[PDB]
Amino acid sequence: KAYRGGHLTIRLALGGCTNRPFYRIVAAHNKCPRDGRFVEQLGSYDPLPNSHGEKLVALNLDRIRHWIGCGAHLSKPMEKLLGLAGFFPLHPMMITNAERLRRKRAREVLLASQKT
Amino acid sequence: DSHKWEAREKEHYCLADLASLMDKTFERKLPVSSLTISRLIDNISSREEIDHAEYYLYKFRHSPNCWYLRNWTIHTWIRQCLKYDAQDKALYTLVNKVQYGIFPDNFTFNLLMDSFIKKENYKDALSVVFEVMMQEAFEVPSTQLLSLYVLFHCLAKKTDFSWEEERNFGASLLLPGLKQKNSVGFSSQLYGYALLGKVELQQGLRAVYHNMPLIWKPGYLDRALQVMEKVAASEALDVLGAVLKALTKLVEQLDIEETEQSKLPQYLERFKALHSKLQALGLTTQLVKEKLSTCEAEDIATYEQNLQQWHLDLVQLIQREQQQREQA
Amino acid sequence: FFVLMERYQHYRQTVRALRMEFVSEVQRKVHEARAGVLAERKALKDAAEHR
Amino acid sequence: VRPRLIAELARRVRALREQLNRPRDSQLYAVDYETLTRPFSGRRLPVRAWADVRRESRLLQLLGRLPLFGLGRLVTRKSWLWQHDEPCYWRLTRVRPDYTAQNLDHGKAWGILTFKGKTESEAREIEHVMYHDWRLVPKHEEEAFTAFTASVPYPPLLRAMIIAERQKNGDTSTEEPMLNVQRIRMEPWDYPAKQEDKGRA
Ligand SMILES: [Zn+2]
User: Fold this and answer.
1) Which structural domain range is residue A86 located in?
2) A101 and chain C in contact, CB less than 8 A
3) Where is coiled-coil annotated (chain B)?
C-alpha cells in the first residue's frame, strides 16, 4: 500500500447508456486505474450543447493549474479543450480540421461543376 | 630484423594458471585484465599458443572488459607474429580487425611495411596492405613506401568489372592523395569516383546508402571536377570505361534532391576533351623512389621508448593487483 | 501535414510558455495567500486582544 | 495485525527473479536479418521497418567497425538524414562497449549529442539510437552534415477577456504581458522522443 501523487495522466472513459454520450474526465497516474487509487477526482465534461445551442463549460482549472505547476501531464481531450477554450491558443488540430472542411467544400464545388 | 624484440619480459609458457583465470572470469562474468592477455601473447612460441591467444582475445572482445585492450598487447602480438611467421593468423586478424582489435596505431605500420618490402612479397603482402590501409594509414616514416607499393601493385593490376573489386579499388585510392604527377593513378581515381557517384545517385534504389558509406549529397562529380582542376591548374582508364558503357512505391530520395540522370553525352565529350588536353600537357615509380631517397630513416628510438613505457605501466599494474590481492 | 506540424510546434512552444506562466501564477497565488499581511495583522490583533 | 507473508514472499521472489535475470539487449532482443522480428516478444514491426532492419546496421557496431571504438570518428543517422540537413549526427567522444554479443552490436553509448548545431555533452534522453538507420562516415569526408551556418503575447480571446475584466474592475489597459520559451527548446515533429515515460520492455 503506497500512493504516488507524482506526474498526472488524465484518462477519459465515455461510460454510460445508449443514446447518451457524456464525457467523464478522470485524473490519475499512468500506472493506476480510473476508479482505483488516483490523485484528484474532477467533475465531468459536457460534450453536446444544451437547448438553443449554448455549450456551457465550467472551467475548473483552479487546482489543475496548481497540479500542472507541480507536475501534471495532459491528454488529447484536455489538450483540445484547453486549446479551443480561451487560455491556450486555438488548437492546431481543430484549425487543420477546419482547413480540411474547406478542402471538402472545394471538392464539393468541383463535383457540382463536373456532374450537373 | 629480429633485434626489435628484446624487451619481452617472459613469464611462463604453461597455460594452466592463465586458462584457469580466464575461465573463472568468463564463468563469474568478471572483467578480464589485460595483464593475462599480455602474458599469453609474450608466452607465444607455437601455433597452439597463437591460437589460444587469438581465442582469448576474441573472448576479451566479448567479456565485460571490452575496452582495456592496451596498445602493448597489439604491439607484442604483431612483433611476435613478424618474428615468427605472420602468414595466416596475422593475415586473418588484419583482414578482420574487429573480432580481435589488433589496431596497429604505432610504428607497427613501418615495421610491417619494411618486413613486406625488404622480403619482396606479392599477393599476400598486397592483400594485407589493402586490408590494413582500408581504414587508416600514412603516418609513421613509411607513407612513401606504402604509396610506392600501392602504385606498383595498381599498375600491375588493371582490372575491375566486379562490384567488390571496384569498391576495394575506390576505398584504397580514396585516402592516398599526394601524387600530383601520376597519370594512371589519377585516371583510376577519377574512374572510381565517377563509378561510385553513379552507383549512389543515378542507379538502383537500394545501392545508395548501404554499399558506399559516403556523403548523401548530389554533388559527386564535383569531386572529380576538383581533382582534374588540381591536376591541370597550369584520363585513360576512365575514358575506356566510358567508351565501354556507351553502348548498353517506396522511394528513398527527396523530391528537391533530384538525381542528375539525364546526363551522359555532354559529360563524356567534356571528359574526352579534358583527357586530350591532359595528354597534350601531362615512370612514376622512379619519381617515388627518388622521393624515398630522402626519407626511410626507421627511428626505432620511439619503438624502444614506447616499449619501456608500456612495460613500466604493466609492471605497475601487476604490482597494484598483487597488493590488492595480498592486503585484502 | 507540414502545416499540421508547423502549427503544432507553434502551439507546443506557446503551451510551454503558458506552463511557465502557470508556475509564475501559482507562485503569485502562494504569495498572496501566505505573505498576505492581512492574516498576520489579524493574528497580531487577536494576540493583543487575548493579552 | 498479521501481514500476508505468503503473498509478500511470492511477490518478492518474482521481483528478485525479474531483477537478477535482467537480460541484456542481445539475448531476447536479438534482431533477425531476414524475418524482421524479435524472439520472446513476437510482435510485428512498422511498415517503415520492412527494409530498414535489413538495409543498414546500428550505431555502436558501426563505430566498432572502425578502430579505437570510434573515439574520434564521425557517424550520421540515416533517419535524420532523411528528415534533417542541419548538423544532427553523433560525434562520439566516450563510447561504452557492449559485452553480450559479437561485432559490438546492441549497447548503451552516450556522449556529445549535437542538435541544430549545439554540441551538447550528456544531453537529455537519447532516442533513435538503437535502430538500424545509420550511415558510416570514416575520417575521409569528415564534415558534411553541418549545413547550418512562439515568442508572442496572448491570443485575441484571452486579450479580450482580460480587457473586459479590467474594464469591470477599472480602466481598460490594452497592454499585454510578455512570455518566454527559454526553458524547453523548439522540438520539431521529427524530434527523438523522450525516455521519461519509457521504462523498459
Ligand atoms: Zn450519462
Assistant:
1) 1-115
2) no
3) 296-328
